[PDB]
Design a protein around this nucleic acid. Structure first.
Ligand SMILES: [Zn+2]
Ligand SMILES: [Zn+2]
Lengths: 276, 377, 162, 267
RNA sequence: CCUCUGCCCGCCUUUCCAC
RNA sequence: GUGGAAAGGCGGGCAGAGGC
């Protein structure tokens, strides 16, 4: 479907405070062979999609011209009226929770949200344009697990009656703070008009996650994840056709998500703008 | 009130369970010095070994094991206290004071445990006719406290590490539901969980000095070396009662202390006023009790007659406060034979039992001053 | 029971707990290991479970004696801070090993009275190994003591100490 | 129904352990980082004591605020230890195992509760998410260096037992993030937050505290607003309300809306 | 170093298939 | 011309109460 190229973003997710992404004495999820923790791709994609739908919901007025089909929603959840595709923004009842998923391919081509994360509706659906891989540990932290150090902790938290001061403690496992991860996000350039927007929106939602939390408790301190990029390479359609290493590389080993979202958006991606 | 400052009227030693071995000390003068082994040992290497690990473990004839640094080196000390007495032939173990950065402060757990003894004394004075209605609710053992007849006259025969005060703290502070015994303590039921005392500001190096505590009560007195805050040092401490924590617990407190507060008025309102009237009635009563015994040293009585006409609240702390000042047993003097069989039951003298001087024999006073007096206001 | 049930590796780890909770039986049976450990001046001369087997005999040689914990902790809570600086922090802990041997010399010079042969049981066995850390790295040849560090601590609780 | 977003008021600053600081775990060790071996105040343990003190503040004032914050017509001041109902007219209406806590049972009751809109509610069916997030606060940079050079960061305090405590004078870094989800009530939620911090400077933090292990004291470095425009553009164009030599008893004091005039300028 | 506490409450699949 | 497309294991919870 008009495939042009794939933009790959590789960076290190870093846990400044102890990450906890559970399973159901409260385990963080683990590889069933190595036993080392990991961050899923369902759990990182959907935390970016979540924080960004709350972002668009506040801006259903300013964005009606840059994004068409955003004038059909009024900001809110369609939870009060148990009908899907009413006039609100959060309009698909998945099971009990209401999520913005656009109803139709020709509207989801014009939403800022459903164009990047995709949508499902009768009479076809829009496949996502990103692939959020699972974020395993880096090899420096395998080789601290090989070295015999800890890699998860067991934290004990208590709830307290405020009048009697009676304590009833519970324990959460969480990954040790400091653990470096390794992510990869593979955008799919299906249109060449909106590829800058979908990358600026993917970096907007990554900047929300650096002041929100990823996974677990977070309001009590479990998030505080930090994104550290390495390199963004755009793979052209001809590169696959031949397998010759002939692809643009935007190199930024030490940059934030706010130092790359607008500081270098046109200064680093200028060579990606050229080749389309 | 907040930041209710104090002063110090006698030597005051808050222990940390630590003594200074003579390898830590070398007194060049009447002043003494605390050498830094970690820095001095690592500073005496440049001139060179395994001899330091052999000699310090050997502990030979102390003097030479600290004066051997004088050869081709000098001047490695940490705190440099003063001796303030006619002693120190090293042969001593200076007990050290609690310090947070090498700076002496008063811990708040130690000033609360002195108020708790004063408050426990006031509760057993006023509360046997009312002490049964406290344990009438969910205890069922007040009939034994009624048939004996003022729960103290039962507790002398009730006993007849050490958990001796287990029932008496469970009557004056916290009635539990049930146990294998009759009743037990519940920390959730306590007016003293509303009493907040905090650690004081640090005192200072100038007010800290070594002392020479002589034990009197035997024909051969023994000396103990110790460091203590000199009298005349004044720091500031803040004590307040959180009245909001009492209003929430008006139905949940079950003790004789709570049945001393509902008679002075609103029980969540007079607890701070009950608190100091308990202080100046335990500690003035132990102040007058020590004017009976004259076995000390003369000048000791001239300290006790001068403790009066002194504004503020007077109380004991520290290490030299004897068995009379850490314990209900000031109130257990008037029993006599009801406590005489129990004091041998608990035991006392060692190396059988002390007959006529069972409890009060030892007096630990520093330089002719009865140590451990701090006056709040 | 004297040097009959107790053997090299794992014969009497479970049966000697009742005998230590005796006087003349442990005064001669445990004295041979406290001399062989003195003859074990090379610390990493035991890659098998010989250390953990000798840890029971040394803790039985420390069972009938005192071994107060407040003198134990500061020597061994300094042994962790050396290890905490191994984790990409430092590579030369030479200046702290002189202070490490000084704290044991300060310990045996402070505990006076009925605790003489207690702390001299402590002073006997470790000084063959406390010379080894000076001319040796940390990534080997220290960590094997760090296992035998707590090996003697734990069975000493198991025979009835603390 | 209708969760929006406008920005994130970020309160940074530095906690001063004026007296020795003990937040334990399971010879009674304070929790430390497993990696660096150094103590810290958890955000779980700081958000609780900030909520423990504020609910008791609201517990004594349920009558005269039901016109400013409605849905306090549900509550009468009390608890539910006297009778086992999860929800009656009493304020502490959450079983929470053996000790009760105040949690409104729904989104839209908690939308007007001044407590559960700030620290967050929980409920069967609909539930309300928290608006402040409290990161775990570690040691500062200059107390790393004191640990690098042999200055004591901990001490054992024989009480016959030892309560370990982080040695007094030590400082920790604390970051508090508030989520502006509705422009009409952000002023109250910043005022109600600093109200909860003024109560912590008089109460204690962790451990026994009634024996003096608390006296925690905040030292502010920066308020930042961070509007929605900041997330879209990386440029540092956000409001920086400096209060660097101010105290929490002076920011919430008259001197508040002089500090918070530039948050108005974005709305 | 002693005394009570040592996980609760939920959703546990929803929706799309052009005769 | 892919047993596919869309789908945050999370929301709330002071390791604390007394113990010099
Ligand atoms: Zn959409
Ligand atoms: Zn509420």
């Amino acid at each position: 479907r008009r495939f042009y190229g794939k933009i790959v973003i590789k960076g290190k997710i870093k846990a400044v405070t102890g990450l906890h992404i559970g399973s159901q004495a409260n385990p963080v999820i683990k590889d069933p062979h190595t036993g080392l923790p990991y961050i899923p791709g369902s759990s990182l994609k959907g935390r970016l999609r979540s924080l960004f739908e709350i972002l668009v919901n506040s801006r259903l007025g300013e964005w009606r011209e840059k994004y068409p089909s955003l004038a059909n929603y009024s900001p809110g959840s369609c939870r009060p009226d148990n009908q899907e595709n009413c006039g609100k923004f959060f309009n698909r009842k998945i099971n009990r929770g209401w999520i913005h998923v656009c109803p139709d391919y020709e509207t989801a081509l014009a939403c800022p949200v459903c164009r990047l994360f995709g949508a499902s509706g009768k009479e076809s659906n829009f496949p996502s344009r990103i692939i959020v891989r699972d974020a395993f540990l880096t090899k420096e932290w395998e080789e601290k697990w090989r070295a015999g150090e800890a890699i998860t902790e067991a934290k004990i938290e208590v709830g307290i009656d405020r009048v009697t001061s009676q304590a009833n403690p519970r324990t959460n496992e969480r990954v040790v703070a400091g653990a470096e991860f390794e992510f990869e996000i593979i955008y799919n350039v299906e249109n060449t008009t909106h590829w800058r927007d979908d990358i600026k929106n993917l970096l907007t939602a990554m900047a929300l996650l650096e002041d929100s939390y990823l996974g677990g408790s977070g309001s009590r301190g479990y998030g505080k994840v930090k994104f550290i990029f390495d390199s963004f390479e755009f793979r052209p359609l001809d590169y696959y056709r031949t397998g010759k290493d002939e692809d643009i590389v935007s190199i930024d080993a030490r940059e934030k998500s706010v130092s790359d979202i607008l500081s270098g958006f046109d200064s680093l991606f200028s060579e990606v703008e050229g080749k389309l | 009130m907040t930041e209710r400052t104090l002063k110090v009227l006698s030597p005051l030693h808050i222990g940390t369970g630590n003594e200074l071995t003579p390898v830590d000390i070398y007194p060049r003068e009447n002043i003494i010095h605390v050498l830094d082994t970690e820095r001095l040992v690592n500073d005496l290497m440049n001139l060179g070994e395994l001899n330091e690990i052999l000699a310090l473990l050997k502990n030979p004839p102390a003097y030479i094991w600290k004066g051997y640094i004088e050869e081709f080196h000098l001047d490695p000390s940490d705190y440099s206290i003063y001796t303030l007495k006619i002693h120190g032939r090293k042969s001593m173990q200076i007990k050290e004071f609690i310090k947070l950065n090498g700076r002496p402060y008063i811990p708040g757990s130690s000033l609360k445990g002195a108020i708790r003894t004063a408050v426990l004394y006031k509760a057993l004075k006023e509360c046997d006719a009312r002490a049964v209605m406290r344990v009438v609710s969910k205890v069922n053992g007040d009939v034994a406290r009624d048939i004996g007849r003022d729960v103290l006259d039962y507790y002398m025969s009730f006993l007849s590490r050490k958990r001796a005060d287990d029932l008496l703290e469970a009557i004056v502070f916290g009635m539990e539901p049930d146990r294998r015994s009759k009743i037990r303590y519940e920390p959730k039921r306590d007016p003293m969980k509303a009493l907040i005392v905090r650690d004081s500001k640090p005192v200072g190096r100038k007010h800290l000095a070594v002392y020479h505590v002589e034990v009197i009560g035997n024909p051969q007195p023994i000396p103990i070396w110790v460091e203590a805050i000199e009298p005349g040092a004044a720091t500031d401490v803040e004590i307040h009662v959180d009245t909001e924590a009492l209003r929430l617990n008006a139905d949940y407190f079950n003790g004789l202390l709570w049945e001393c507060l509902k008679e002075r008025g609103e029980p969540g309102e007079v607890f701070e006023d009950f608190l100091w009237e308990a202080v100046d009635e335990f500690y003035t009563a132990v102040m007058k009790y020590e004017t009976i015994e004259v076995q000390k040293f003369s000048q000791v009585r001239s300290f006790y007659a001068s403790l009066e006409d002194h504004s503020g609240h007077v109380l004991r702390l520290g290490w030299g406060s004897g068995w009379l000042a850490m314990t209900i047993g000031l109130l257990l003097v008037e029993k006599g034979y009801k406590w005489e069989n129990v004091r041998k039951k608990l035991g006392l003298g060692k190396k059988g039992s002390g007959f006529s001087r069972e409890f009060p024999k030892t007096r630990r006073l520093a330089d002719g001053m009865p140590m451990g007096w701090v006056v709040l206001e | 029971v004297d040097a009959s049930r107790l053997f090299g590796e794992s014969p009497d780890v479970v049966g000697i707990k009742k005998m230590l909770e005796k006087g003349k039986q442990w005064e001669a049976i445990q004295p041979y290991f406290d001399n062989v450990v003195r003859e074990a001046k090379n610390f990493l001369e035991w890659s098998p479970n010989k250390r953990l087997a000798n840890a029971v005999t040394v803790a039985a040689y420390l069972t009938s004696q005192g071994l107060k914990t407040n003198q134990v902790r500061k020597i061994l809570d300094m042994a962790r801070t050396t290890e905490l600086k191994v984790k990409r922090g430092e590579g030369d802990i030479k200046d702290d090993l002189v202070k490490m041997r000084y704290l044991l010399a300060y310990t045996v010079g402070k505990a006076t009275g009925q605790s003489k042969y207690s702390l001299d049981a402590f002073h006997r066995i470790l000084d063959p190994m406390l010379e080894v850390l000076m001319g040796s790295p940390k990534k080997e040849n220290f960590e094997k003591f760090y296992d035998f560090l707590q090996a003697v601590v734990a069975y000493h609780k198991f025979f009835g100490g603390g």
